Design a protein around this ligand. Structure first.
Ligand code: MG
Ligand code: MG
Ligand code: MG
Ligand code: MG
Ligand code: MG
Length: 261
């Protein structure tokens, strides 16, 4: 008997939690006999959800509960985009758990942008999603968070990989490099005058939605409109802002990572 624990930072908001449900459904369909469990690593988000009647286990709680149920084989899957700080803290609570349980074998699955192969697959999926927009000469801008962690290199790396698919697919980050000014300089080279944006994030969290599309003077929508672009935000059919985890083929990459060799 195998069990799977899905690891994310977490969110208290309805739209990200619908994306989480899609990820659970993808894993449950692939492994219909397995228990699938969740942990949200943000302590404060867990606390706010508890105030709402929604009870999410802390990581140590989540794994101990699996141990107390008899499981000797546990999969712990990162739902992160890059192998950065949160991925490292995953490994840490996984090892704190392995130490207390020498008989339990724990398999760890990597985040989305782990390898060049992963980033090509993501680029192809996003190209497919936006091909009709790209065909009209409109650019697609992907907004990642950005970090000082060395894994920040994935954003510049997937930006270059995306050039094999279209010059109109452009990646930047809010807090690091490539920056919004790099995005604007790249846009200028394409000849586009219209932009569709999407977060290069697993879910469209509340803070990210403001960074991307808010009326704040430094939101990406404002800064691109100041530059003269006509800006649209990508949405799901249900009207929510889209994110990577909403795309079934993206969810399959986390799925494959859980068993990769
Ligand atoms: Mg990440
Ligand atoms: Mg799609
Ligand atoms: Mg990101
Ligand atoms: Mg969404
Ligand atoms: Mg969807």
């Amino acid at each position: 008997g195998e069990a799977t624990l899905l690891v994310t930072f977490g969110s208290s908001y309805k739209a990200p939690r619908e994306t989480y449900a899609k990820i659970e459904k993808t894993f449950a369909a692939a492994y219909p006999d397995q228990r699938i469990s969740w942990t949200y690593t943000s302590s404060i988000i867990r606390k706010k959800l508890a105030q709402q009647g929604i009870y999410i286990d802390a990581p140590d709680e989540a794994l101990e509960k699996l141990a107390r149920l008899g499981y000797k084989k546990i999969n712990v899957q990162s739902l992160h985009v890059i192998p950065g700080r949160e991925y490292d803290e995953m490994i840490d609570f996984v090892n704190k758990f392995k130490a207390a349980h020498s008989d339990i074998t724990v398999k760890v699955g990597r985040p989305l942008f782990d390898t060049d192969e992963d980033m090509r697959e993501v680029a192809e999926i996003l190209h497919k999603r936006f091909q009709q927009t790209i065909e009209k000469g409109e650019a697609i801008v992907f907004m990642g968070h950005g970090t000082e962690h060395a894994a920040n290199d994935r954003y510049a790396r997937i930006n270059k990989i995306m050039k094999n698919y279209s010059k109109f697919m452009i990646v930047g980050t809010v807090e690091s490099d490539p920056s919004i000014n790099d995005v604007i300089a790249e846009l200028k080279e394409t000849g586009a005058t219209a932009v569709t944006m999407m977060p290069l994030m697993s879910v469209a969290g509340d803070h990210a939605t403001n960074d991307m599309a808010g009326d704040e003077d430094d939101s990406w929508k404002t800064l691109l409109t100041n530059a003269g672009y006509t800006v649209s935000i990508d949405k799901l059919d249900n009207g929510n802002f889209s994110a990577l985890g909403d795309i079934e083929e993206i969810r399959n990459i986390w799925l494959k990572h859980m068993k990769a060799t």
